[PDB]
Amino acid sequence: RAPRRQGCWKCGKTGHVMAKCPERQAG
Ligand SMILES: [Zn+2]
């Protein structure tokens, strides 16, 4: 969630969902 702290570009923004995002950024 709250992608602004990275733009999720290494979290997975190339195809992830904001509820799978917490697995890579603890939030
Ligand atoms: Zn993310």
UniProtKB/Swiss-Prot annotation:
A zinc finger (CCHC-type) spans 6-23. It is found in: Virion. It comes from the Viruses. Encapsulates and protects viral dimeric unspliced genomic RNA (gRNA). Binds these RNAs through its zinc fingers. Acts as a nucleic acid chaperone which is involved in rearangement of nucleic acid secondary structure during gRNA retrotranscription. Also facilitates template switch leading to recombination. As part of the polyprotein, participates in gRNA dimerization, packaging, tRNA incorporation and virion assembly. This is Nucleocapsid protein p7.
